[PDB]
Design a protein around this ligand. Structure first.
Ligand SMILES: [Mg+2]
Lengths: 100, 49
RNA sequence: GAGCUGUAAGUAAGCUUUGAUCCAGAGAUUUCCGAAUGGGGAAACCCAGCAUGAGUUAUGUCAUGUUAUCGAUAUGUGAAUACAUAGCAUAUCAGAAGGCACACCCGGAGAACUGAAACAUCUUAGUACCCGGAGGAAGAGAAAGAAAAUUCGAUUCCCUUAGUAGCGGCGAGCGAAACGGGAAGAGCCCAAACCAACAAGCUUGCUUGUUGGGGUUGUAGGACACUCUACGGAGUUACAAAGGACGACAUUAGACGAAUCAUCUGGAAAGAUGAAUCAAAGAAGGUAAUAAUCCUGUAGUCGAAAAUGUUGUCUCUCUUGAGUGGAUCCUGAGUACGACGGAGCACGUGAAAUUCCGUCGGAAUCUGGGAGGACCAUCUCCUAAGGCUAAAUACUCUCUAGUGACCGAUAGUGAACAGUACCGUGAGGGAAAGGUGAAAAGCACCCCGGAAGGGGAGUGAAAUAGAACCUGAAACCGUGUGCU
RNA sequence: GAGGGUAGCGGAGAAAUUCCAAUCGAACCUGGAGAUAGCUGGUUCUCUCCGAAAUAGCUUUAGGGCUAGCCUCAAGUGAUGA
RNA sequence: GACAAUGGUAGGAGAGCGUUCUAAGGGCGUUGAAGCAUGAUCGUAAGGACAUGUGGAGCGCUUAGAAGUGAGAAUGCCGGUGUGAGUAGCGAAAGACGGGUGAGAAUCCCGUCCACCGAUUGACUAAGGUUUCCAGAGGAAGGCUCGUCCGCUCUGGGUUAGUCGGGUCCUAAGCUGAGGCCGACAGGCGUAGGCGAUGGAUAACAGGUUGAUAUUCCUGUACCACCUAUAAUCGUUUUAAUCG
RNA sequence: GACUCGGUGAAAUCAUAGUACCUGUGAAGAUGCAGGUUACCCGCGACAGGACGGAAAGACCCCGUGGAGCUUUACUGUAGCC
């Protein structure tokens, strides 16, 4: 489960192996947007004259994995209660720095 | 006044009623006397005029 | 615990880590109509009285309360009529009224087509329809019973007895019960004799009334007579009733939850090939093809501020129980029965006993009364004419969790997008209509054209996937050709 | 012309079986209801072996039914068949 | 191996083919499943394969089990598409020409001439309908042809009351009806009283003005109810003026 | 109106159709059968002899132990009345 500012890795699709970072979330369809991944080309009409534009489209969230902060490998995520508050762990190391 | 059958000699059947022998007499009802319908059998039995 | 302002896409303007949107519990608000209830009315509107209040020099206007009919409970008053009464008036209460899944249950009333190879007794059938009353069940229920052993011991339901015994234009057809095997199991309260009081007549004797106690039955019990005895039991499901405490479970939101990498083909891998790992988890669904190890989950374990529902332990609240005498007193009356006319019992009035309704008659009192299929005698069993009662049983418009050698868009609900288009004055009848792609990346720009449509270019793995969008059969309509 | 009344086992009729929503020897709608139909129509893949009847008798029977006759399958007995 | 048998309707008997689903086993599939199309293939029949094109994600085989298991006919039910056929019809009637607009004109707009109705094809008010009304834009469908037009599509607008017609007034027929009478239930009737116009009562006219309203808006001049001030007349409130 | 040209454009019906006549034959009145006799391929305007032409599961007739309305000294009942 990934937040808005993390640094992830793509594990499925055309762009498998790229890193990028998250910029949008869309939780109702569970599809994130990652920079430089899944780029599309739109035909926009004049609204100024338009033309072909390139932006990123959303990818399904289960095609993305976080990176172990220490060893820098993909990992799943668990939870832990500290100070009576929930944090994220890397299933291969300790705490996971996710402030922004 | 329940219902029943009238029977012929060939035993054909038709619906029919038995009525009660109601009479209009003046009986003592709470306080003032009133004039109501009462059967003759109930009159012979359990009520005073 | 990071996005959010319905389906629902946009833009705009905003909200949110000082915790939003969202989920559960409890509150607040809740226009008008409708039983509709101040009066009226062609529902969703019109017109008022009374009392407060705002406003106006004052009217007009506005705001908030209250005003149906029956019923209950008080008070006052009182006609034909003297007392009285019927009425009448005032004030408190809020008892009824209407609706439904009204499926199942209990009552009232009750067909015909049909079968009998016609039809009338009979059957369809006490079925359909209509009306009333209710509950989570209802009804029945504690022997005036079943029987014929050496008996049993309230009721209901299941299996058998058995298509037997019986009934029947003895035709068509209708059709039990006891014994036996099981589910469940529970018993109680009155009326009366009598006693103690109170009260009116009365003459203080009696009568009657009111309260309380007592008391409840068959090989007879209880009153009375007498002799032996006391707070442990009982309880809100009948057996009398209220309400407190502290607990324990279960709902109604949730939380944690093990383990995988690489190459090939490809638009994309979960597939193939190779090497690994978890399992109290190899249910299931998603993810760009087919995943135990990617996501949501699963096995397992944890969790409630609040409101409900059960259930314990205390509290609480009630309350003596035996024996002998047995026939002195009490023991359910217009009742039980009978005749006539009907109905229900498997049973068509018959050898009809047994049980109800209408109309007339009309008992007995323990040496009594009823039943054992006309009736009589003897035997055996029981004790009517007052009431209450859980469980085993029936049903599903619903809610929660699941299941299927059930359907897969002419099927399955009439209805996957509707009791809607539409039809009918009305009651009422009643359709057709699912699929782009993995992702909108939904075709910038150029050309012909008023547009619609099209040809290129571009997106995409694919555009003969371009929205009349998966696949795209046949009928049917065309264009070009080899032989004729 | 407007506002009203009479309703199907019924109403209305200067009378014709006439009218009661383009329908009347008994309106329309929903239910009993899949009424009943000894009558007519229909009833869906293949090959192999055998193969009729259109007649007695009774029948509220005569284009229906029942028993017998004639077909088929299986078992049995054994000259009973032509 | 020898011999024999083998037409067939009602109808009896036997052996099989194929369809959907389930169980167990064993397989195939993005290097392309089912379906669809074509072929000169195989089996005694029902039927089974293989190859190629299209298609884009599921499906065979073996043994056994279970059935909504096979269509050419029912004046069958639903959908689609033909034939008749470029055929019948295009719903009473008088139009002609010039100018305009437009991609496009017999059919739209403007003008002149001609024609038809005129106890009416003219002008008012009711029922009934319910936005059809007006302006700007449009031309896919509707319009029995056409269409630049429209009662059609899109966007935005439009109905003004003390006196007009209803209510805050009255009653007819009829309908309801507190108490009441009757009735298996449901309910039927009816007294006082209510409701109910098609009738009775009841105060406003002339002119101006919009694309769309007018006795309603504006100007002028009126009338009818009700309330408060300013007042002559008011004189126990019997009476008196007053009201009743 | 019909007929020719421009616009628009249905219907009943329909087993498939390359659909002649005569004398016969035949379920006894033939475009489809036999023996002959006629006839190059394709339209348009007209006529009504045949296709037992279309339309409506004959209303006449008979049958069904089918319905309904009406009558009476048919059978059995019954509302009422005495
Ligand atoms: Mg063609």
């Amino acid at each position: 489960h990934i937040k808005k500012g993390d640094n992830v890795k793509v594990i499925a699709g055309k762009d498998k192996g790229k890193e990028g970072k998250v910029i949008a979330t869309l939780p109702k369809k569970d599809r994130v947007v990652v920079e430089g991944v899944n780029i599309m080309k739109k035909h926009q009409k004049p609204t100024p004259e338009g033309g072909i534009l390139e932006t990123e489209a959303a990818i399904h969230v289960s095609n993305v994995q976080l990176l172990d902060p220490k060893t820098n490998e993909p990992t799943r995520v668990g939870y832990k209660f500290v100070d009576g508050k929930k944090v994220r762990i890397a299933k291969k190391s300790g705490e996971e720095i996710k402030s922004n | 006044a329940s219902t029943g059958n009238r029977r012929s000699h060939a035993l054909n059947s038709t619906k029919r009623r038995w009525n009660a022998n109601l009479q209009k007499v003046r009986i003592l009802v709470d306080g003032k006397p009133k004039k109501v319908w009462v059967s003759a059998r109930a009159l012979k039995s359990g009520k005073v005029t």
